[PDB]
Ligand binder design. Sequence first.
Ligand SMILES: Nc1ncnc2c1ncn2[C@@H]1O[C@H](COP(=O)(O)OP(=O)(O)OP(=O)(O)O)[C@@H](O)[C@H]1O
Ligand SMILES: Nc1ncnc2c1ncn2[C@@H]1O[C@H](COP(=O)(O)OP(=O)(O)OP(=O)(O)O)[C@@H](O)[C@H]1O
Ligand SMILES: Nc1ncnc2c1ncn2[C@@H]1O[C@H](COP(=O)(O)OP(=O)(O)OP(=O)(O)O)[C@@H](O)[C@H]1O
Ligand SMILES: Nc1ncnc2c1ncn2[C@@H]1O[C@H](COP(=O)(O)OP(=O)(O)OP(=O)(O)O)[C@@H](O)[C@H]1O
Ligand SMILES: Nc1ncnc2c1ncn2[C@@H]1O[C@H](COP(=O)(O)OP(=O)(O)OP(=O)(O)O)[C@@H](O)[C@H]1O
Ligand SMILES: Nc1ncnc2c1ncn2[C@@H]1O[C@H](COP(=O)(O)OP(=O)(O)OP(=O)(O)O)[C@@H](O)[C@H]1O
Ligand SMILES: Nc1ccn([C@@H]2O[C@H](COP(=O)(O)OP(=O)(O)O)[C@@H](O)[C@H]2O)c(=O)n1
Ligand SMILES: Nc1ccn([C@@H]2O[C@H](COP(=O)(O)OP(=O)(O)O)[C@@H](O)[C@H]2O)c(=O)n1
Ligand SMILES: [Mg+2]
Ligand SMILES: [Mg+2]
Ligand SMILES: [Mg+2]
Ligand SMILES: [Mg+2]
Lengths: 733, 731
Amino acid sequence: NLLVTKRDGSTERINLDKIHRVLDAAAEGLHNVSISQVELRSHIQFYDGIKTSDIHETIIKAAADLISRDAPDYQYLAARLAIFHLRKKAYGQFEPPALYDHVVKMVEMGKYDNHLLEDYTEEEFKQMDTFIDHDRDMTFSYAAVKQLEGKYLVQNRVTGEIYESAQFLYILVAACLFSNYPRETRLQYVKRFYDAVSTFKISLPTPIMSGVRTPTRQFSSCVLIECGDSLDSINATSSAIVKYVSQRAGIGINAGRIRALGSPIRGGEAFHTGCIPFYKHFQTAVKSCSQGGVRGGAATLFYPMWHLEVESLLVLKNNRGVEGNRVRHMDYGVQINKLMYTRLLKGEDITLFSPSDVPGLYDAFFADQEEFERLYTKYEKDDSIRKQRVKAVELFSLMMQERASTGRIYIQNVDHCNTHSPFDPAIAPVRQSNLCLEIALPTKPLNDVNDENGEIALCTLSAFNLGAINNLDELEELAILAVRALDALLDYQDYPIPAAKRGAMGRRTLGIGVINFAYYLAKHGKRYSDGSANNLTHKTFEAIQYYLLKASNELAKEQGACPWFNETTYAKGILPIDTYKKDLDTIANEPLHYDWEALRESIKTHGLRNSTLSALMPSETSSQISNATNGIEPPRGYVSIKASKDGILRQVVPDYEHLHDAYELLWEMPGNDGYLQLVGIMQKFIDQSISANTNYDPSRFPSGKVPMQQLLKDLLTAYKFGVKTLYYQNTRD
Amino acid sequence: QNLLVTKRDGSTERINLDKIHRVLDAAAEGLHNVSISQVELRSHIQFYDGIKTSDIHETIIKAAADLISRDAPDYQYLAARLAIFHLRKKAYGQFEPPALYDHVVKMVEMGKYDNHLLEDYTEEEFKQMDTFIDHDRDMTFSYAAVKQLEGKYLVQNRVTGEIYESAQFLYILVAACLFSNYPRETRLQYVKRFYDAVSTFKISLPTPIMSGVRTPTRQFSSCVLIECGDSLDSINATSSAIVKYVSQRAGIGINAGRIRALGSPIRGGEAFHTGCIPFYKHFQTAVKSCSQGGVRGGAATLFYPMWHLEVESLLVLKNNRGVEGNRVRHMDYGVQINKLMYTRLLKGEDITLFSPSDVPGLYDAFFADQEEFERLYTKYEKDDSIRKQRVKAVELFSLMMQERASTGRIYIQNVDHCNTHSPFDPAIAPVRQSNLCLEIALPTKPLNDVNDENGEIALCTLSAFNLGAINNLDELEELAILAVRALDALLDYQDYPIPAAKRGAMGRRTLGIGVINFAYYLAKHGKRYSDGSANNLTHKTFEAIQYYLLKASNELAKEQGACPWFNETTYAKGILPIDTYKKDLDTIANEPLHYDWEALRESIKTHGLRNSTLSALMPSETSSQISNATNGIEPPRGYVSIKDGILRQVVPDYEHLHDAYELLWEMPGNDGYLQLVGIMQKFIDQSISANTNYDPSRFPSGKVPMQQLLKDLLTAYKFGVKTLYYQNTRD
Ligand SMILES: Nc1ncnc2c1ncn2[C@@H]1O[C@H](COP(=O)(O)OP(=O)(O)OP(=O)(O)O)[C@@H](O)[C@H]1O
Ligand SMILES: Nc1ncnc2c1ncn2[C@@H]1O[C@H](COP(=O)(O)OP(=O)(O)OP(=O)(O)O)[C@@H](O)[C@H]1O
Ligand SMILES: Nc1ncnc2c1ncn2[C@@H]1O[C@H](COP(=O)(O)OP(=O)(O)OP(=O)(O)O)[C@@H](O)[C@H]1O
Ligand SMILES: Nc1ncnc2c1ncn2[C@@H]1O[C@H](COP(=O)(O)OP(=O)(O)OP(=O)(O)O)[C@@H](O)[C@H]1O
Ligand SMILES: Nc1ncnc2c1ncn2[C@@H]1O[C@H](COP(=O)(O)OP(=O)(O)OP(=O)(O)O)[C@@H](O)[C@H]1O
Ligand SMILES: Nc1ncnc2c1ncn2[C@@H]1O[C@H](COP(=O)(O)OP(=O)(O)OP(=O)(O)O)[C@@H](O)[C@H]1O
Ligand SMILES: Nc1ccn([C@@H]2O[C@H](COP(=O)(O)OP(=O)(O)O)[C@@H](O)[C@H]2O)c(=O)n1
Ligand SMILES: Nc1ccn([C@@H]2O[C@H](COP(=O)(O)OP(=O)(O)O)[C@@H](O)[C@H]2O)c(=O)n1
Ligand SMILES: [Mg+2]
Ligand SMILES: [Mg+2]
Ligand SMILES: [Mg+2]
Ligand SMILES: [Mg+2]
């Protein structure tokens, strides 16, 4: 005699057969799943007059809780049930409308960009509708669908109303990005690109997934802003942060130029009150807005190791201090070079300077290591220059201690970023990184928010799904599609800050990485830790960079090289294979299989459409769409528990049934050596950097505490193999 | 063995107590009831072998300063002169200052003085200005004055600590700079007259003028008012202007009430608005990012309407019982209230809260049109389609007064009073905010960029009349001419880092001239604050002040032209403050107008005013110490006030007036004080930094009841009080 409340507000007798019908449809083709089990977990929570939507959410939750090693197919059962509900939420029915009718209505509501109706005819929308396979929504895993409804699908962030479905997302991303292409080839690209992303061969980032089709055009994930030593630059930097955080971007801030506490201002008219009060101002700029209504804003701030306030800056995330000297809600990257490590190894002292007191030292730190060492030792001997001496061991230990405590103190090897780089340090040095330490681009400080002479670096991302290819030669066509889409995006999107448009239009920097690398190694029967994957990694990432360059080179023939191509090492006929750190020759003997010399000349002759092409991002969120292992990281477990706005999610490794023994889980590794070696080998070909993690299990160490010696050893090992940056440090609980 | 001292050059010589004694005799000349032996004994015991001669001098300064008392007040002059002696050595290497011209040349060469001085004046003119100077006026400072001189005002290295000048050089060059664009026929006559006025303490100058005017950095406006719009572009523009102006000696008043509430849709729902508090935090770090020109810390007051949707969250931002996520403690706040809000309180009704983005026209009418506000308010209160929240008026007001009592830093602005009794036409240029210390009330316009030419930032330049230095009220005629001319010339002389600020300054040319030594003034007339015995005297006094201020600015309009936007003032329509004051004042004062305001009215309507505003009563907490004045209109805490460390300051003429003063905690309540404020406000163009005071021990169970807090609040409104500054609670 129990009643349920329908969508129209009316009530009718409960019908358990209707629910069974829906469960049957979602369980089609699945193995080792039980409808009864979901029913048992669901029926008990029903009550008189329960809303029909609350019933649907109950059975989704019930199926999601049953995701396990014994029955992994619950990941599709839970996903499909969620898909069913999302259809009702968006369309009021299961079957999606015609694409054209959908677009017209959505443009009328102001949810889609007007250009869609201007750039495509009704005939073309009907033709694009034939490209769409809505049954591909039944190929998602549960974690994927939660990211879709939570972040990616176009929706009202106040109401919660869903406006679209996954395949409309995919086709309109493709339609918008190729909207400026000639009608002779346009739809052919739209279809090819739609297939590539909807069948998970190419992975798209969050701001593209949630942005490309909306009236707000900003799809770059990474924004790099260099701050100058003036109030005008600090104000400009702060404004650019607020504007770009609110428009879907994560921020990298370089504030190393700012003079130290106690420095004179205007000849001594003022006493400099320090960097920390300005860091706080950058922090509130980041936390002032949400990231385009999708997630919270975040930033990583960079400063040199030899900065005079470095001992104060290193403990900014430490919870044991007053608010006066704590800036906890930002991450930090300490910038290091060969000389600093040398002082550590020789057990010597490091001299701290304010960049305002040492002419030329800051610039040489990134561009010229010989000049740096000349100026550094010269200023160390100058009594007239304000300075402070610290033991290198104590300084490094403090850094690694804070890195261990928080996990969010990062390292950037600035010499590696410039000796092995797509840029000439004498023309455009790399002086910072981004939020997740995989981006390395040239920048220039601003004197105003609208300063035409400043440069903010933008990087637009994507990733190759290494688990979705049978041969490395598939990367060629995939690279062409990826490069063309991201490069066309640069002309398509808008730029709230003029200095950012400068860097984007001048360099056209792309950052394309990989996902499902752990799955990839598992299929080849290799491991992270023992070194069995060294040569396979070398072979694999050679193919990736080669086809990326080849695609960008061909696109230069068609549309012209980027305006500032002559500032690259590529322009001088220098390739990544020429400048890598030679210690890599001791850990890999895989030969080059592709014709780089023919490629070298073609680049030297026609140039590149893009100054950078590769960067290995963590893909923490975006990789969940294809149920991939994120980036290059090994999974935590066969069934991982990840975070979400709704609650906890269970995510299964791809093909657990056949590869349960093939995977090497994160905490099954003896140490970081094997991992750091793979990262170094990757870096040989990667244009920018890699979001490299370090991992430590306290229980594997005596007295349950990781010795400082081990931390410093892995740090030096990373530098030895040319690793440019270090991201998270994970400490097991 | 013999005890040695270390000289300045690093050498040593046998200690000579006679040298110290001789220095003490020079500083004690003409003083009474002081003992050199007392100072020497306290100093000698702290001496040690090889003691630096400069540490010797600092010791005898401390010794004299510790003997400052009611019994022997002249130690305040003993300690000061000793401090002046030492400051001479630091700046010149000797007691006697160099010739003015040689000093200026060297300081310009060192980059400590502005280049224009050597361009605008000849060597002959500097030698002539040197004849105006009386360096012996340095011996007329009190100790607190000299501590502010060496600490904040004298040109010095903020990293080194090196002093570069003395007080009379400060005074002569402030005058020389401000009148530097004057015709040579009258220029040096203005320089001498103005130098005499400030060095003999007739006119009091504010901190950024005292520490700024002669330096290469030209920004001397004390108050900067920035209105923020509901957009990121405006928020970014506001943040930039704050950082720039704090760094250049200014205090900030922020209007952030237009910002839509937490939960509001953005771009039709593309985003969820995360609230005002994260932006308030961004403003706080902007204020605290810089020092104020190297002199003191940055500070700001932020303003919002009482009917804002987040008002309950905004009111507790200084409350120390919360996580950092919803606490912005290092800023002050001004709650904006009007008649309709008070009515709901008195009637025991509800107040409806809105986000200004959801109530078209309500925010503007809140300041400009009380009739239209009530129409829109009641209309929107019944609209179900409009997001809203209802709160009992009693509970909302109690929360506000609770946080005001706990912190002392939650302020009140009666926005209707600020626009019905104003030099500005609310239909053209409404007053929508105040400043840091709640005495400034000027028009603003939000910016869309830091370089936006269509925005308006309000700047106010300050000064004060020393009421304890005048013999008759007609001496204000001369002093007003000097004060107005100096501040008006300053506007063309100084620079403007933000274009929107230059717009308001050049367009309205708003000045804020107040008073100091008011407590000393009442004491000389045998009046008190509390009983109402000074109501008519206050009326008579502040009538003369505003009249002579308007008259000075009216004459200045004839000579140089009225301000560009004079047409936006009530003065332009022939309306005077004596026409628009709150009528309840007629019940607490029957003093007639002694000056010809009708003749002035005709003159203003014809020739205009050089300045849109002229009067504002600032607290003058720092600047008043220079003349050893009682600060502003506030009564002293004691005969010896304790304000490097601790300072002792004696009220002027303690010997003859110890019985005439009425100390702060000798008062029954705030009624007598609030009536004086209301009477003052009748003539004041802008507002007054009005304090409320409470002694818990006078109340049952040692706690001031909310009913009493609300009574004083309503009393202030009753008498047309525009703003409320500090609430002081006795310990
Ligand atoms: N009478 C019912 N008794 C039990 N479950 C029901 C009943 N009607 C619908 N459900 C279940 O509720 C869930 C949500 O279905 P649905 O979104 O179609 O709700 P609805 O009220 O039927 O909507 P509409 O009337 O627009 O079709 C489904 O799992 C469906 O099987
Ligand atoms: N052909 C289908 N294949 C898969 N899922 C479907 C199909 N048709 C409908 N669904 C989904 O199943 C759920 C229930 O659909 P539907 O409203 O038709 O049934 P019901 O609500 O149980 O019954 P009714 O609403 O007619 O009382 C919805 O979430 C809908 O999107
Ligand atoms: N009042 C202040 N308080 C604290 N820091 C300040 C202040 N003014 C400027 N700074 C800092 O001093 C540095 C220089 O400031 P800025 O360049 O804008 O002024 P400037 O006139 O060029 O002086 P300088 O010639 O010394 O550089 C910057 O790091 C800025 O943040
Ligand atoms: N991502 C964001 N997170 C939080 N607050 C935001 C964000 N973007 C904008 N805001 C706030 O929303 C308000 C409106 O923003 P703004 O005017 O700059 O953008 P807009 O495109 O004009 O949007 P709208 O048309 O809704 O006004 C401002 O108060 C601003 O601070
Ligand atoms: N030999 C001394 N013994 C004791 N007190 C002294 C001696 N010389 C100076 N003083 C006192 O020290 C204080 C500081 O005086 P002053 O600045 O002139 O020091 P100084 O070393 O004598 O400098 P300078 O050489 O420039 O005259 C004064 O009170 C002075 O009387
Ligand atoms: N004529 C004066 N009137 C008042 N104070 C003076 C006079 N001459 C000097 N002083 C002050 O007295 C202090 C001491 O002056 P001065 O250096 O000449 O004497 P001293 O330090 O005691 O002895 P010494 O000759 O060893 O320096 C200084 O602070 C100086 O400014
Ligand atoms: N929570 C996050 C995650 C990523 N990012 C940005 O996205 C870049 C790559 O991160 P990612 O590949 O994990 O991001 P997703 O696109 O996978 O969400 C980083 O450099 C950040 O700039 C961010 O701003 N905020
Ligand atoms: N600590 C202070 C005090 C005052 N002020 C500014 O000075 C104005 C009047 O204060 P005041 O007259 O007490 O300042 P002084 O000139 O006496 O130092 C206020 O409106 C503030 O804008 C400031 O910026 N910082
Ligand atoms: Mg139904
Ligand atoms: Mg500078
Ligand atoms: Mg001496
Ligand atoms: Mg807007």
